[PDB]
Structure 1
Amino acid sequence: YICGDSTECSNLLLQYGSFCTQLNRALTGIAVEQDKNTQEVFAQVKQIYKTPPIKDFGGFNFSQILPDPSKPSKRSFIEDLLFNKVTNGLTVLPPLLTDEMIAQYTSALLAGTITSGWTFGAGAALQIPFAMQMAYRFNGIGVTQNVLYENQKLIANQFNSAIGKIQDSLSSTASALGKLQDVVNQNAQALNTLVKQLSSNFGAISSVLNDILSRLDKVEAEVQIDRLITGRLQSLQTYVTQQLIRAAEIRASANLAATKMSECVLGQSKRVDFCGKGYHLMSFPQSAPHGVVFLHVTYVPAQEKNFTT
């Protein structure tokens, strides 16, 4: 980027020294950190699970979020749609963990929660009938457990229709993913910037190293090349600093996400309105490129009546 395979340019670049080491060391630090974040987010289970083939779950039609057997990979239908809704010297390093294994991790967590509730999060997994699992959530939010048994059918119909509402919301437009899209575009912008300033002069006679080498005296050419060296070096510094700041942003957000997943997937948290409006009941995760998606299922009272007390 600084020399472009010019011998004299590298010879002059030797005069500063430790810039190369600190630059690429900071970039490598970023490179380690990002995959560390991914590992922290999705490693919280130590064993893999597979759902039983039966679907007796009281009409709880999870058909969209489970893996697809026939179609490639183990992605879910919503996870499939998220891919559709989102589209030298510089080098892009491949991600550590593949999409397929991320999908397997999501499938394992979903299977574990459906089959067990919180026991697997505690330790060795224990199976339990699904209706029993739903009972203890309502026990957790203070309502007597008889309501669930007396209105299971209505609850199931509402849950399925709400899945339909989710499909509609993702089907209308892709603005909902606006965060992830924005994040992606961010890096690209910076990348393009780093290229443009390559045609600058920084007070030099021209933007081509060889021409300035050729058409002038050697000492004057060296004086000229110093300008390009300084300009490109400080531009690289600016890009590095911007990367550092955005890395801080993303890593803080990622740890926030990890805490949210731990406190909302495996167990029933009593924090008020921390995971969506209303009293929390449970949550289901879904993978996406560079991101995670939560479906919170929650309880809301609807109609009221006056009474004297």
Structure 2
Amino acid sequence: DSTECSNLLLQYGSFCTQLNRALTGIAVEQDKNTQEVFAQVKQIYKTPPIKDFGGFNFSQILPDPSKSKRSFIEDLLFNKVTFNGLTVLPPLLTDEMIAQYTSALLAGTITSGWTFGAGAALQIPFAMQMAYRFNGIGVTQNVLYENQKLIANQFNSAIGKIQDSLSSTASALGKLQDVVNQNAQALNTLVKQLSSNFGAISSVLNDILSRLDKVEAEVQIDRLITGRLQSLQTYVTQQLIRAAEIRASANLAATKMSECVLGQSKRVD
């Protein structure tokens, strides 16, 4: 925000405004992604007091009321995933409110079948719901109930192996730590590019203004603005194309939340 520079950045026209708007667009697109994925529920369906879901133990994936009130597996996930004009704006749905919203999606997905995508959440016992799942793979639901206690132990064991897999192996969260690392690399690159000379006499703008009169400093600062602006456009363009991978992933996730969560899908693999 140095006045000797900002008067020169205004000569570069709508670039700076449209970059603020593009990143604001991205930021609102993230809250949008988050609502279009998670906010597919119009009421917080709240978990029942008793938990007799036939034997399927959700205590690892439901919230723990002692704790932000995340689930146990979300705390594994929150452990395993890891200022110079930059900002982070908080998610409107906070990591806490998302724990409630995912607890609603999950509490619907437990208590109410696929119905809460279409209607109100219509309760259906979780054992009853798995017949409405086995028929969706062309398996007759007698193959569920004549295996009910077995499938409970299989699901519970698989949830065991998930806690073990996640707790053992940080690279199980490959894509998330990869996206966090990509943003961090992009930001630290964008920051290192604050130091890159671009053929100006300095890495630091305040040195230029400490050293030069504002008839010569113009030329050095113009090179540094041009380089920084090019790096900021390069950053934002990477962030937009990355945001297209994120938003493809968000609509893919929203689709999996519509079809794999709020429903079932006959789309093999």
**What range is the shorter-chain TM-score in?**
0.7 to 0.9
- SS of corresponding position for 1:219: coil
CA 1:20 to 1:78, structure 2 compared with 1: closer, same or farther past 3 Å?
same
Q: Which string of whole-angstrom CA distances, capped at 9 and with x for unpartnered residues, describes residues 282-301 of structure 1?
A: xxxxxxxxxxxxxxxxxxxx
Partner of 2:126 in structure 1?
A: 130
- SS of corresponding position for 2:215: helix
| Cα offset, 1:170, TM superposition | 1.8
CA 1:146 to 1:174, structure 2 compared with 1: closer, same or farther past 3 Å?
same
| Cα offset, 1:63, TM superposition | 2.0
- SS of corresponding position for 1:48: strand
Q: TM-score, normalised by structure 2?
A: 0.86
Question: For 1:75, which of 34, 52, 70 is the aligned residue?
Answer: 70
CA 1:34 to 1:219, structure 2 compared with 1: closer, same or farther past 3 Å?
same
More helix by share: 2
CA 1:124 to 1:200, structure 2 compared with 1: closer, same or farther past 3 Å?
closer
| Cα offset, 1:113, TM superposition | 2.0
- SS of corresponding position for 2:217: helix
**Equivalents in 2 of 1:259, 1:210: separation in Å?**
49
Partner of 1:95 in structure 2?
A: 91
CA 1:153 to 1:94, structure 2 compared with 1: closer, same or farther past 3 Å?
closer
| Cα offset, 1:264, TM superposition | 1.0
Percentage identity across paired residues of the two chains: 100
CA 1:52 to 1:181, structure 2 compared with 1: closer, same or farther past 3 Å?
same
Between Structure 1 and Structure 2, how many residues are aligned? 268
- SS of corresponding position for 1:49: strand
Question: For 2:163, which of 151, 164, 167 is the aligned residue?
Answer: 167
The structure number with the bigger radius of gyration is 1
Q: Which string of whole-angstrom CA distances, capped at 9 and with x for unpartnered residues, describes residues 271-291 of structure 1?
A: 222xxxxxxxxxxxxxxxxxx
2:55 touches 2:152 (CA, 8 Å); kept in 1? yes
**Equivalents in 1 of 2:214, 2:44: separation in Å?**
67
| Cα offset, 1:103, TM superposition | 0.9
CA 1:119 to 1:86, structure 2 compared with 1: closer, same or farther past 3 Å?
same
CA 1:204 to 1:32, structure 2 compared with 1: closer, same or farther past 3 Å?
same
Q: Which string of whole-angstrom CA distances, capped at 9 and with x for unpartnered residues, describes residues 166-193 of structure 1?
A: 2222232121101100101111112222
2:37 touches 2:253 (CA, 8 Å); kept in 1? yes
Q: Which string of whole-angstrom CA distances, capped at 9 and with x for unpartnered residues, describes residues 124-156 of structure 1?
A: 233333332223333333333333333323232
Which structure 2 residue ranges, 5 or more long, are not aligned?
none
- SS of corresponding position for 1:218: coil
Higher relative contact order (CA 8 A, sep 6+): 2
More strand by share: 1
| Cα offset, 1:31, TM superposition | 1.8
Q: TM-score, normalised by structure 1?
A: 0.76
Which structure 1 residue ranges, 5 or more long, are not aligned?
274-309
**Equivalents in 2 of 1:176, 1:168: separation in Å?**
11
Q: CA RMSD in A?
A: 2.6
Moved more, 144-153 or 31-40: 144-153
